[PDB]
């Protein structure tokens, strides 16, 4: 049993052309996907292998667009900023500052900021981890490539079901890659006991079961976990262990992100 954790969200669309100024419907579809994936309401939970069904987690984390901005003014939770920057840089975090062609974050203690923009080459999106929250508060949040934001619509296959944001919100909530970021070895860890030890990342739509040198017997590795690198339509769960780690950030006494719950209701009611 658990109480619902409520996350006020602001989406910052930063566009260099009309194609990048994505629709309100496309944004609403991304918030819908986050609520499905973090509340185990995703229809494709029907695709989770039965061997992992008893490990699938319901994070009971709800996302709502903000209705009050940091100045106390009414908002629909969507900002739109034209820019002369053609491609934003993860190294510079330039999408996160209006001085650098982007848009400043809204009080990161009270809002999840999701920037949407053009990113380079094979980067679908990126996050800032909770360990950087005290030292880098103004860049906390998530950035998603405009071609991989929302479900269907303007999103491009095979990353067209809004799972880049599920994966990045996972990192923003302290989750690490399921394979342990160790280039294929068995010695790295994601520090989640119920995710099977896994060599390297998976891609595309793997066949179940997929064993590797780290988990050499069926049911193998959880390549359909959101924290892998598989295609959007082929990922369909968080585990109960990942849910425990994410929710710990909202512990009322020690949670790094505990402040977000104090005014979440006030900031998401018009």
């Amino acid at each position: 049993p658990s109480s619902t954790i409520l996350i006020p969200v602001v989406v910052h669309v930063v566009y260099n052309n009309s194609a990048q100024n994505i629709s309100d419907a496309q944004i609403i579809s991304q918030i819908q996907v986050l609520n499905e994936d973090f509340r185990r309401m995703n229809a494709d939970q029907a695709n989770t292998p039965s061997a992992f069904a008893n490990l699938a987690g319901n994070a009971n984390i709800e996302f709502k667009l903000a209705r009050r901005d940091p100045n106390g003014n009414t908002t629909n939770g969507i900002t739109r900023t034209s820019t002369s920057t053609e491609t934003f840089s993860m190294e510079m975090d330039n999408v996160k500052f209006s001085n650098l062609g982007g848009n400043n974050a809204w009080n990161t203690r009270r809002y999840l900021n999701i920037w949407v923009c053009n990113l380079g080459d094979d980067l679908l999106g990126y996050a800032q981890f909770p360990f950087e929250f005290q030292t880098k508060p103004n860049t906390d949040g998530v950035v998603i490539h405009y071609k991989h934001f929302g479900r269907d619509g303007s999103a491009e296959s095979p990353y067209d079901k809004g799972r880049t944001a599920t994966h990045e919100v996972g990192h923003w909530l302290d989750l690490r890659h399921i394979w342990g970021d160790d280039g294929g070895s068995c010695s790295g860890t994601d520090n989640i006991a119920d995710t099977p030890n896994q060599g390297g990342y998976n891609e595309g739509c793997p066949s179940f079961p997929k064993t590797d040198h780290c988990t050499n017997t069926s049911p193998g590795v959880m390549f359909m976990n959101y924290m892998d690198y598989t295609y959007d339509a082929c990922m369909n769960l968080f585990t109960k262990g990942q849910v425990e780690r994410m929710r710990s950030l909202f512990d009322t006494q020690t949670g790094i992100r505990r402040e977000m719950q104090i005014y979440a209701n006030e900031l998401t009611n018009p």
Partner: peptide, 14 residues
């Protein structure tokens, strides 16, 4: 998140 299949379209042409 990185797309591991991104450069296929680029590497198979001039």
């Amino acid at each position: 998140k990185r797309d591991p299949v991104y450069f296929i379209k680029l590497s198979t042409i001039k």
